[PDB]
């Protein structure tokens, strides 16, 4: 049994044409395999807000799921149907995607076509949370927005800057892909150290788009080390000092507005 | 003197402090107090790995070294930094504390705070072993990771499993929330009453909750409702999918060669 898509973000959608594959499979007694497809076809046309994740982070995730496979988008999309069928679902009985799903020259290949091939597939409906469907284009919109704190809904998690390390505070290079960026302003976020270690942070998105981060509570340099944050409120917007005392004054001021809004969430357990 | 933390699972960094904290009474011809704090603000996140260790099992640790007083994290977590240096520390002249330390609503109290309140505060920095500092965190981490051979060069002996209740024998280890070891199969050094010693093959899985099952080799009184600890010794294998049977015998025969190649290295 294979599932066939990008898979962006893994989001709730995502998650549950994986886990109806992993459920024929058991049915069926057979192996799963997942093909991610690099890119969508928007990602080379104007306009593209970013992925949502690298593709090694993708991959990551989706190789929790079962063997996991990428498809160069640039490569498969001059395929014909046929020609993808050949080289990519020879034995496959059982095929899961999502709606809308497109493959091959001038997107000619679809669920129909592989029917026609003795490949039956099964088109997951869209997982819809408060009225709206669930897609990485409806991600990465409340990303540019700011609205990280209505992303879990749709994403399963927390949206999250991660990156190479390049008062005190510590820049991300997040590589060279493609990724959306956050609404520029000031965000409240959970950074995961490399030793294993969670901190608190008030992370900063300025102007291509800067991050860089102050963690709570930490000392030492992270130069070369990779971090994970979790991007969990929008504190505040952009705002420009004419003075640095007027910018200390804001930092300190962040960092307090921080310290509030951590108690909040501790006690918002009991 | 007073230390105060929370130390879960009393390991290296920590010992660091207790030790400090027992060297600057002797010179200031003062007592010894440790304030352990109950719970870290992490604790009650849903993403915790859980305690290395029950709080009981850390005071009868920390005691070791000095009298020992737990501080609730309900009855502290609302004062004002003002309010908890009345409360907790009148009359203390001198505190150890782990660098960033944080008290009070809003995390606002620290170093700071106390020395302008006349207390001197001592902090000790964090211990490094191999490239990275000693935590409860990193330790937490290792134990679900299931690398319990690297655990005794953080946390300054094996990490260890201790609760109640083909024999095995299953372990509850008890209401609080503590952190869970990488499912599978692991060679375990058995800690039962009276002093005795026995090697065990113990296999954590699921049911969600995680069960702590030990087969003890050459042992056969299983203690019913007896206490019992388990130092988790070697990771042996991720768990699997009736040769269960056959597994077992697998797993035992592992077991007693690597418990004979300890012995040979006499």
Same mark, same amino acid.
């Given at each position: 049994? @294979?599932?066939?898509?990008?898979?962006?973000?893994?989001?709730?959608?995502?998650?549950?044409?994986?886990?109806?594959?992993? %459920?024929?499979?058991?049915?069926?007694?057979?192996?799963?395999?997942?093909?991610?497809?690099?890119?969508?076809?928007?990602?080379?046309?104007?306009?593209?807000?970013?992925?949502?994740?690298?593709?090694?982070?993708?991959?990551?995730?989706?190789?929790?799921?079962?063997?996991?496979?990428?498809?160069? $988008?640039?490569?498969?999309?001059?395929?014909?149907? %046929?020609?993808?069928?050949?080289?990519?679902?020879?034995?496959?009985?059982?095929?899961?995607?999502?709606?809308?799903?497109? $493959?091959?020259?001038?997107?000619?290949?679809?669920?129909?076509?592989?029917?026609?091939?003795?490949?039956?597939?099964?088109?997951?409906?869209?997982?819809?949370?408060?009225?709206?469907?669930?897609?990485?284009?409806?991600?990465?919109?409340?990303?540019?927005?700011?609205?990280?704190?209505?992303?879990?809904?749709?994403?399963?998690?927390?949206?999250?800057?991660?990156?190479?390390?390049?008062?005190?505070?510590?820049?991300?290079?997040?590589?060279?892909?493609?990724?959306?960026?956050?609404?520029?302003?000031?965000?409240?976020?959970?950074?995961?150290?490399?030793?294993?270690?969670?901190?608190?942070?008030?992370?900063?998105?300025?102007?291509? @788009?800067?991050?860089? @981060?102050?963690?709570?509570?930490?000392?030492?340099?992270?130069?070369?080390?990779?971090?994970?944050?979790?991007?969990?409120?929008?504190?505040?917007?952009?705002?420009?000092?004419?003075?640095?005392?007027?910018?200390?004054?804001?930092?300190?001021?962040?960092?307090?507005?921080?310290?509030?809004?951590?108690?909040?969430?501790?006690?918002?357990?009991?």
């Amino acid at each position: 049994v @294979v599932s066939i898509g990008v898979f962006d973000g893994v989001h709730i959608g995502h998650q549950k044409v994986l886990r109806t594959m992993k %459920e024929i499979a058991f049915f069926r007694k057979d192996d799963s395999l997942i093909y991610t497809i690099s890119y969508p076809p928007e990602y080379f046309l104007p306009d593209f807000p970013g992925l949502l994740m690298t593709v090694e982070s993708r991959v990551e995730m989706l190789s929790r799921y079962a063997r996991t496979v990428v498809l160069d $988008f640039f490569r498969i999309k001059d395929l014909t149907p %046929e020609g993808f069928v050949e080289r990519y679902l020879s034995g496959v009985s059982a095929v899961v995607v999502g709606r809308d799903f497109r $493959f091959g020259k001038n997107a000619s290949g679809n669920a129909s076509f592989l029917r026609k091939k003795g490949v039956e597939v099964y088109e997951i409906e869209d997982v819809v949370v408060q009225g709206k469907r669930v897609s990485s284009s409806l991600i990465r919109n409340l990303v540019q927005e700011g609205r990280v704190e209505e992303i879990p809904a749709y994403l399963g998690r927390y949206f999250e800057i991660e990156g190479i390390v390049h008062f005190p505070t510590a820049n991300i290079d997040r590589g060279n892909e493609k990724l959306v960026d956050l609404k520029r302003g000031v965000y409240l976020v959970r950074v995961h150290l490399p030793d294993g270690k969670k901190k608190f942070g008030v992370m900063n998105v300025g102007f291509n @788009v800067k991050y860089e @981060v102050y963690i709570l509570d930490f000392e030492g340099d992270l130069y070369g080390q990779r971090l994970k944050l979790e991007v969990l409120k929008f504190m505040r917007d952009e705002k420009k000092f004419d003075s640095i005392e007027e910018l200390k004054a804001a930092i300190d001021q962040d960092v307090k507005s921080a310290r509030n809004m951590i108690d909040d969430i501790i006690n918002s357990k009991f």
